[PDB]
Structures are given as structure tokens and as C-alpha cells.
Amino acid sequence: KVVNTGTVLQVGDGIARIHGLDEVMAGELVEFEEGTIGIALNLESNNVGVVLMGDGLMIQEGSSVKATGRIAQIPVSEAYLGRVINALAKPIDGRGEITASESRLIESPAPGIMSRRSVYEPLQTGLIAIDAMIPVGRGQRELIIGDRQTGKTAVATDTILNQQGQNVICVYVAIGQKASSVAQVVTNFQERGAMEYTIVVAETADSPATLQYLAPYTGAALAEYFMYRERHTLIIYDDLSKQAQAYRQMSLLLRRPPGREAYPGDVFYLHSRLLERAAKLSSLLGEGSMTALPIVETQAGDVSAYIPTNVISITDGQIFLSADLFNAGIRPAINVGISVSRVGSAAQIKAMKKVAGKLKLELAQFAELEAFAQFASDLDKATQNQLARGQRLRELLKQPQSAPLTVEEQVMTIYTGTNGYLDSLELDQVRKYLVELRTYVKTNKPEFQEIISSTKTFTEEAEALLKEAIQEQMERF
Amino acid sequence: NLGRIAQIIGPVLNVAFPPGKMPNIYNALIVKGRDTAGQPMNVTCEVQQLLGNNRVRAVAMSATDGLTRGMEVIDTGAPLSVPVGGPTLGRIFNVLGEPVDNLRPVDTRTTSPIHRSAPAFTQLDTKLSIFETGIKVVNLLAPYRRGGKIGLFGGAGVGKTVLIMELINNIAKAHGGVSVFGGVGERTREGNDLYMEMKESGVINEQNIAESKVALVYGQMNEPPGARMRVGLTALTMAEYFRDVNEQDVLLFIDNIFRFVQAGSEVSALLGRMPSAVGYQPTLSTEMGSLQERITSTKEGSITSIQAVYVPADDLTDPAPATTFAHLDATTVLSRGLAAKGIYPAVDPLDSTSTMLQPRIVGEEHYEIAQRVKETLQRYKELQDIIAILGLDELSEEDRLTVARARKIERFLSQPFFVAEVFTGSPGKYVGLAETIRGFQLILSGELDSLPEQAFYLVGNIDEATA
Numbered sequence: 033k034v035v036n037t038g039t040v041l042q043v044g045d046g047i048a049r050i051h052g053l054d055e056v057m058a059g060e061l062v063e064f065e066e067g068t069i070g071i072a073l074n075l076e077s078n079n080v081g082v083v084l085m086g087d088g089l090m091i092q093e094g095s096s097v098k099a100t101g102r103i104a105q106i107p108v109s110e111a112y113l114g115r116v117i118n119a120l121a122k123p124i125d126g127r128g129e130i131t132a133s134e135s136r137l138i139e140s141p142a143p144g145i146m147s148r149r150s151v152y153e154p155l156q157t158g159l160i161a162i163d164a165m166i167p168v169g170r171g172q173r174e175l176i177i178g179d180r181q182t183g184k185t186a187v188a189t190d191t192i193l194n195q196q197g198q199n200v201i202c203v204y205v206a207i208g209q210k211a212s213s214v215a216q217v218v219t220n221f222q223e224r225g226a227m228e229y230t231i232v233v234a235e236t237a238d239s240p241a242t243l244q245y246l247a248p249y250t251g252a253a254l255a256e257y258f259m260y261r262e263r264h265t266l267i268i269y270d271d272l273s274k275q276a277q278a279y280r281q282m283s284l285l286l287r288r289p290p291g292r293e294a295y296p297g298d299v300f301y302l303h304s305r306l307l308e309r310a311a312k313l314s315s316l317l318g319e320g321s322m323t324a325l326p327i328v329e330t331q332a333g334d335v336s337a338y339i340p341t342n343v344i345s346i347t348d349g350q351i352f353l354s355a356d357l358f359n360a361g362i363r364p365a366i367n368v369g370i371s372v373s374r375v376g377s378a379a380q381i382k383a384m385k386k387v388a389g390k391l392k393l394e395l396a397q398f399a400e401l402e403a404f405a406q407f408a409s410d411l412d413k414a415t416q417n418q419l420a421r422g423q424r425l426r427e428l429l430k431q432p433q434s435a436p437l438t439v440e441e442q443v444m445t446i447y448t449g450t451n452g453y454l455d456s457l458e459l460d461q462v463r464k465y466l467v468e469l470r471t472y473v474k475t476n477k478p479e480f481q482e483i484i485s486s487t488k489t490f491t492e493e494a495e496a497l498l499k500e501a502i503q504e505q506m507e508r509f
Numbered sequence: 510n511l512g513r514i515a516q517i518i519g520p521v522l523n524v525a526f527p528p529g530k531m532p533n534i535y536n537a538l539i540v541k542g543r544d545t546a547g548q549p550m551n552v553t554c555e556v557q558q559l560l561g562n563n564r565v566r567a568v569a570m571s572a573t574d575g576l577t578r579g580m581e582v583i584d585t586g587a588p589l590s591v592p593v594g595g596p597t598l599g600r601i602f603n604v605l606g607e608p609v610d611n612l613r614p615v616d617t618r619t620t621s622p623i624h625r626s627a628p629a630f631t632q633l634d635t636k637l638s639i640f641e642t643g644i645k646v647v648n649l650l651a652p653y654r655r656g657g658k659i660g661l662f663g664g665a666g667v668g669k670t671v672l673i674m675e676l677i678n679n680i681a682k683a684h685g686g687v688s689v690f691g692g693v694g695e696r697t698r699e700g701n702d703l704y705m706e707m708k709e710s711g712v713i714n715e716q717n718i719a720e721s722k723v724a725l726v727y728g729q730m731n732e733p734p735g736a737r738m739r740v741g742l743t744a745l746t747m748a749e750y751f752r753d754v755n756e757q758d759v760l761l762f763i764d765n766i767f768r769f770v771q772a773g774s775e776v777s778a779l780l781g782r783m784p785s786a787v788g789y790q791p792t793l794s795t796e797m798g799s800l801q802e803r804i805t806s807t808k809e810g811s812i813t814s815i816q817a818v819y820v821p822a823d824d825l826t827d828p829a830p831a832t833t834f835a836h837l838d839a840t841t842v843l844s845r846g847l848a849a850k851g852i853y854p855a856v857d858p859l860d861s862t863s864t865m866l867q868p869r870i871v872g873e874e875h876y877e878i879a880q881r882v883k884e885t886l887q888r889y890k891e892l893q894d895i896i897a898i899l900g901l902d903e904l905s906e907e908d909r910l911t912v913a914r915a916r917k918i919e920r921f922l923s924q925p926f927f928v929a930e931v932f933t934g935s936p937g938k939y940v941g942l943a944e945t946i947r948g949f950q951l952i953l954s955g956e957l958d959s960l961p962e963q964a965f966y967l968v969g970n971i972d973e974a975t976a
């Protein structure tokens with residue numbers, strides 16, 4: 033049957049040239065004798081170019097192939113929420129199979145312009161430096177940039193953690209990450225009960241390249257099942273860089289014409305799709321949304337690089353992280369100076385705007401004289417006020433990994449420094465101030481904390497009532 | 510006609526017809542079978558080669574996933590025809606002219622080929638009118654020639670879009686003619702936004718009384734490459750109607766025309782040609798050129814196109830944006846470092862021209878100052894690398910004056926936007942010619958040497974810079 037079966041011509045480097053199979057469709061799954069799954073892309077004149085999804089060491093020139101007839105479908109449901117999933121949606125954790133009732137496609141068109149609405153719904157991440165100057169709202173695409181070891185994954189680890197139950201569903205997609213390292217994470221997510229609402233769509237380095245592509249695509253489809261259901265999602269794709277690389281590898285193995293850094297001619301339709309399929313659907317579809325936070329590693333702080341260039345131009349903001357501003361105390365390292373957010377403060381409440389907006393104007397003025405501090409032989413107080421109130425807020429902006437702060441905890445804290453309380457204090461000390469003060473308010477004053485959130489804003493009372501709090505509390509240092 | 514798909518290699522179709530039928534080049538074909546159980550026909554391509562051997566190749570405008578070999582293709586018999594006319598205003602269009610705004614079908618009078626031979630040499634004109642925008646950097650250091658084409662250049666995130674919005678606000682909502690905005694390779698948000706924003710100002714149809722003065726065609730990022738290579742041409746075919754059929758004066762807002770080249774980049778090597786400078790196609794100059802000389806003003810009317818162009822890795826030597834420039838009567842080159850300073854709109858007062866900076870077309874006061882402004886803006890720029898290491902202690906009392914004034918210029922050259930009221934945090938301000946002209950003449954005269962720098966930063970008029 034040269035119609036729904038075929039012979040294998042050649043298997044070279046995870047790609048196979050199938051012969052026959054006239055009926056195949058572009059994008060259809062084919063099944064090998066030794067049972068190896070692969071997709072079809074080159075519907076060339078008399079042979080089919082198929083990209084394997086596994087160790088092709090198995091395919092043998094002469095073996096036949098069946099045409100699954102299915103255009104790469106993936107199972108989906110609720111049955112996940114706590115299962116480190118593979119790439120063709122099959123468990124890799126050893127807890128049994130997954131009860132899939134429906135099954136959505138990996139690649140599907142993204143929500144258009146009628147099916148969408150601006151972003152107003154906030155997205156709390158537990159990072160004082162993010163949810164106050166880098167406002168990420170639901171449905172909005174926010175990029176995470178940084179070299180090797182730049183606390184980026186950490187920005188992500190805390191964020192998914194920082195999601196109050198029933199609030200936001202999360203998908204953790206690892207592309208080309210290490211097994212171990214994925215595990216060190218998939219654990220630090222359980223020990224805090226956060227793995228009861230997050231999937232771990234991950235494909236290690238060893239895993240064949242024809243997968244690190246779909247790593248996100250799956251990870252995105254699995255999430256789109258909650259969106260169209262009025263639910264909200266957050267997608268973290270650990271490195272789109274390692275996915276772009278896996279792309280290049282397939283085009284060259286399919287013998288397709290390359291270009292800049294050997295990158296194919298459809299390298300921009302790898303992000304302008306993952307990141308588009310994410311959005312805030314109209315209320316005439318479910319108000320459901322999906323916020324994607326894609327990571328893109330850099331080389332030598334070289335932003336203008338192709339992949340990082342392209343992705344930045346697809347996302348609604350970036351959270352640059354620096355390799356020079358680590359040990360300098362800044363932990364986590366947020367270059368809030370270049371880190372932007374196209375949605376605007378629109379992704380924040382009023383209680384945050386009142387403080388954050390103001391904190392914006394501050395950590396924006398210091399930036400202009402910062403380089404002076406070290407060489408300040410005789411500056412004016414009108415500047416000192418800035419090189420004073422400067423490195424103060426920063427230490428508030430510093431955060432210990434694994435500890436995401438609530439929104440209350442977020443606003444109250446900014447309030448201390450932003451309002452001149454932590455002013456005349458010593459930087460190499462302020463860290464413990466907040467740590468101490470926070471727990472102090474959570475214990476003795478959790479009555480005010482619940483006043484803050486519900487009211488969603490600081491009343492003229494709680495202010496004075498905060499004033500009495502901090503002033504006397506700093507007085508306990 | 511009827512041929513069969515012969516090879517499907519991504520968004521490229523190699524169709525094989527009978528030795529007689531030969532879809533002429535650029536003639537759009539249309540394919541019969543596609544997505545998951547159900548028969549659509551969205552798969553429309555555009556012949557681009559006669560490989561020979563009874564076989565044209567073609568780029569699809571829709572996704573080929575699911576297509577098959579042998580599927581009957583069909584030669585419509587002419588090029589891809591978008592429906593144009595009055596019945597396109599207030600609607601969001603596909604690269605194929607299909608309504609994408611869920612408001613019923615489009616009741617147009619006649620279609621029209623996105624493939625039209627630009628105006629002849631005797632259908633052109635030389636009139637050079639101004640185009641007051643309302644920003645203290647354009648109308649003063651590089652004005653807008655009506656009919657002419659504006660090139661709003663910059664790198665990834667510099668305020669180009671915010672720049673195309675303020676223009677629709679300052680000029681389009683108040684423009685006394687029809688306008689069209691093309692969506693060439695950009696985010697969807699920006700679309701959703703620019704829509705629900707143009708709705709509130711009622712630039713669109715609040716009621717179907719149809720008093721709209723805008724026609725929208727959106728092919729965003731996600732679309733395959735054979736979509737952003739031509740939505741720039743739908744938007745324009747719909748604009749090349751109001752220009753000559755209703756003798757109207759139309760505006761052509763293309764939010765990034767680069768995504769139009771990038772999109773062609775991607776069908777180049779794919780179709781089997783030999784790449785060129787920086788991975789681009791050999792046919793880069795033939796592609797964005799044939800579609801910037803239809804976007805012009807003629808005697809029959811006019812097209813004031815205010816087009817944006819992406820600048821990869823911050824480099825202007827880059828073949829993609831570089832090419833544009835020729836096709837421009839003005840340029841607003843934005844900076845990433847001058848944007849890293851907070852001064853917005855981040856526009857480099859030095860690298861930004863306009864053919865109409867002629868005293869023969871605006872005046873002497875507009876002519877000198879602009880330069881006087883720039884002159885000092887050349888001085889300080891050639892003083893930086895010097896003072897940065899050589900300090901000021903030995904600088905003459907006649908050169909330290911360049912410094913203060915300049916820092917008063919590069920700042921008085923800031924101006925929040927009515928659309929960017931969320932990035933600046935302060936109310937926008939409309940600063941026309943005279944208000945700007947004189948405002949600066951009060952600076953070049955050291956009439957304001959006392960006042961500080963941040964006195965002109967994010968300020969409306971000179972007075973607002975003295976309050």
C-alpha cells in the first residue's frame with residue numbers, strides 16, 4: 033500500500049526519508065515498525081521528509097511506516113496538576129497514566145483581535161522588585177532575560193510558588209534543561225504544596241531535539257485547556273534559547289537553507305506563536321487568560337543577539353537581570369532600570385500604584401546620579417537625598433529565594449522605606465529590618481494586614497496606624 | 510484551472526498543472542482541503558515561480574498543516590483580490606480581505622488586485638505642504654510633507670508604536686479624510702488596543718450609521734510568512750482606492766513595514782534563491798520598493814503614509830531598514846541610549862531629517878533655530894567624549910555655555926504623549942510650530958541660562974518649562 037504505509041529510505045540524524053505514503057498530510061504523525069513516532073514535513077515529490085521523535089537508532093532502512101492519520105494530538109485535562117509530564121504527554125515520574133477525556137492540538141491558531149481584551153487583571157509573583165515596577169498582568173507576555181546563573185529560573189520558581197490556591201494554574205516547561213536540575217525544582221515545588229496546580233512539561237538535553245521544539249508548544253496547549261474554560265494560566269518556558277537551537281538543528285538535518293548564526297528562516301515563528309497563543313480572551317469567551325513568562329539566556333550581556341532580539345520584540349516587557357549586579361548585594365538582580373512593562377501599572381491595584389508609581393519616580397532619579405555616589409567628593413543635599421533614599425529601596429528590592437511575599441506584605445514593606453522610615457538607617461542592615469518587621473506585623477498586627485487587602489487600599493487610618501507601627505518598630509533595632 | 514499539490518515544504522506549495530494551464534506569476538491559486546475534519550478553503554497562495562516541468566511554486570497565506578499531495582489547486586485566473594471601497598471602513602481585514610471583526614460579511618461594490626502598477630511619471634506632484642504633528646521634535650527638526658512618506662525608525666522597543674498612536678490622535682482623529690492602518694508583523698495587543706481605543710473616540714462605528722474614517726487590515730506576528738509579506742499590500746490596495754476613486758486624501762499608517770521584509774526574507778531561501786547581504790534576499794530592493802511607490806500622493810489625490818521600520822540589533826547599516834530611507838521625505842530615527850535616559854519620545858535630534866526643512870517651504874525662524882538647536886547638539890555631542898575624561902575646569906566660558914543650553918535643549922526636546930499617559934505619568938500636551946519655534950529661540954538666546962535642566966523635561970510649552 034503506497035497509500036497509507038511506506039518503506040524507509042534512510043535514517044540520518046534523527047530524521048528519516050520515508051518513501052510512499054501519498055496520503056500523508058503536512059503535520060501528520062507517522063509510526064515506525066519499531067514503534068517510533070515522528071512528524072511529517074517535507075511532502076517532497078516522491079519521498080517524505082519525516083523528523084523522528086526519539087532515538088532513530090531503531091529505525092531500519094527497509095522497515096515500513098503507518099500513517100497515524102492524526103495531526104499530532106495531545107491529551108489534556110485536570111488529570112495532570114502535579115505530574116512531571118513528558119513531551120508527548122506521557123508521565124515520566126512513575127505515578128501511572130493520566131486520565132485524558134479530551135485532547136487538544138500542539139499547534140493551534142491563537143486568539144485573534146476580537147477575541148481579546150486589554151490587561152487589567154494583576155498577577156502577583158512575590159517579588160517586590162517585579163510586582164511594583166515591572167507590572168505583569170494576566171494574559172500579558174513578560175520576558176525574563178539574563179546570562180548563565182542569573183537568578184532567572186529563580187524569579188520563576190518563586191512566582192509559580194507565589195500563587196494562592198484556586199487562583200492561577202501553572203505550567204513549567206523545561207527545554208534542554210538537565211534531569212537533576214529539573215528535579216531539584218520539581219521537589220522545591222512540592223515541599224511547598226505548589227505542585228498541586230502546576231504541570232512540568234520538560235524535555236532534558238539527552239532527549240532527541242525534535243522535542244525541545246514542542247516542549248513549549250505542549251506546555252502551551254496544556255494550558256490553553258484552562259484558558260478556554262475561563263481559568264487563568266501562567267506559563268514559564270525555561271529558555272526559548274535552547275528551543276531555538278533545537279530548531280536550527282532540524283532545518284539543517286532536513287537540508288533547509290539557513291542564515292544568521294545558522295538559524296533557519298522561520299526562527300521568528302517560534303516565539304511570535306508561543307507568546308501569541310497567550311492572552312486575555314474577551315468576556316464573550318470566558319475572561320480566561322494565559323500569562324507567559326519566557327526565559328531567554330544571553331551571552332556576555334549581549335542583548336542585541338538574534339534570538340534575544342527577536343523574542344524581546346514579541347513580548348510586552350522584559351525583566352533584565354545582570355551578571356555584574358549580583359554579589360553587589362542586589363539579590364535578586366533586577367535591572368529595573370531597563371526592565372519594562374508595556375501593559376503599564378494597569379496590571380496593579382490602587383494600593384500598589386500609590387506606592388509603586390512613586391517608587392518608580394524614585395528608583396528612576398537615582399539612576400541618573402548613581403555613578404556619582406562612589407565619586408561624590410562634595411555633592412549637594414538635593415542630590416544626597418537621592419543617593420541616600422537610593423540604596424535603601426534596593427535592599428527592600430533584594431529578596432531571598434523561595435520566599436514570595438503576599439501583596440499586603442508587598443505594599444506595607446515598600447511603605448516603610450518609600451516614606452522616609454528606613455531613611456537615616458544603614459544599608460548593610462535594612463534587610464533584617466523588613467524580615468523582622470514583617471513577621472512582627474503578621475503576628476501582632478494581622479488585624480491591619482487583612483484590612484489592607486480587602487479594602488485593596490491604604491485608608492487615612494491604617495496609614496497613621498502604619499506610621500505608629502513602623503516608627504516604633506524601627507525603634508526596636 | 511486544476512492542478513495537484515506536488516510538494517508541501519512549509520509555507521511553500523509546488524503545484525503541478527497541465528502543460529497548457531499556467532498560472533501567470535503572482536496569480537493567486539486556492540487549495541481545497543486542510544484542517545481537522547471539515548473542508549475550508551482559506552489555503553490561498555500566490556504563484557511565484559514557473560519552476561518549469563509543468564509546475565509553478567507558490568507561497569500560502571494560510572497554514573499548510575494538514576494539506577496533502579494531490580489536492581486539487583485552482584487557478585483563480587488573476588491575482589489575489591481584496592474587496593475595497595467605502596465598505597471596508599470600521600472593519601478589521603484579513604490578508605485575504607475576509608472580515609475578521611465578526612460584524613457579518615463585507616458588502617463591497619468591487620474587489621481589487623493588491624498587485625497594481627504604481628502611478629506613471631506624469632501622475633506625480635511637487636507640492637510640499639506641512640503636517641503639524643504636535644511634538645517638539647518633529648515639526649521643528651524634520652517636518653511632515655503631505656503626500657510624502659514618513660519613516661519612523663528605531664530598534665526593539667523605542668516608542669515607535671506609541672509614536673504611531675499619538676499621530677492617529679494628533680492627526681487621524683482630526684484628519685479631514687479617510688485613513689487606513691496596516692498590521693504588518695506586530696503584536697495582537699497593539700491591535701486590540703488601537704481598536705478598542707479608536708472605538709471610544711468613535712473613530713469607528715458607534716452605531717452602524719457608518720461615519721467611520723478608517724479601514725483596518727491586520728496580519729499580525731503569528732500569521733505564516735506569506736501573510737505579513739502582503740497585508741502591507743491589502744492595507745495599501747484599500748488605500749489606493751480612496752486616493753484615486755474618491756479623490757480623497759488618505760493616510761497610510763503601517764505599524765512596522767520591516768516585518769514586511771523580514772517576512773519576505775523567510776520565503777527567499779525557501780523558494781530556492783541565493784541569499785544576500787546579512788541573510789536577506791537578492792530581491793529585497795525589488796520587494797519593498799515596488800510597494801512604497803504606490804503609497805504616494807498623485808494629482809488624483811494623496812497618501813500621507815506614516816510608516817514605521819524595525820532596526821535589528823540597533824544597526825542602521827542593516828540592509829532591511831537601510832533600504833527604506835531612500836523611499837522617505839522625512840525620518841525620525843529613535844535612540845535606545847537617548848531612551849535609556851528617559852527623554853521621550855526618544856528621538857535623536859541629530860539623526861532625523863525632512864526634505865521640507867527648507868526656508869523656502871516654512872521660514873527663516875524655523876530654518877535657523879532648528880540648525881542653531883542642532884549646532885549646539887553637535888557641539889555637546891563632540892564635547893562628551895572629551896569632558897567625560899577631561900572634565901570642565903579648563904573649558905572656556907564660551908563652551909560651558911554649550912553644555913547647559915544643550916542639556917536644556919535635549920530636554921526641552923522631551924514631550925509626554927496623550928497615548929503614553931501611562932509611561933510618563935503626566936498629561937500630554939499639544940505643541941505646534943510657533944509654540945515650539947519661539948520656545949527654543951528663547952533658549953539659543955541664553956534668555957533662560959538661570960533655569961535648571963529638568964525645567965524643560967516633560968514639559969509642554971516654554972512657559973510650562975518656567976513654572
Ligand SMILES: CC(C)C[C@@H]1NC(=O)[C@H](C)N(C)C(=O)CNC(=O)/C(=C/c2ccccc2)N(C)C1=O
Binds near residue numbers: 071073103519572573
Ligand atoms: C509540530 C507540528 C505539529 C506543527 C507544524 N506546524 C507549524 O509549526 C506551522 C505554524 N504551520 C501551521 C505550518 O503549517 C507550517 N509547518 C511547519 O513548518 C512545520 C514544521 C516542523 C518543523 C520541524 C519538525 C516538525 C515540524 N510543521 C511541522 C507542521 O506540521
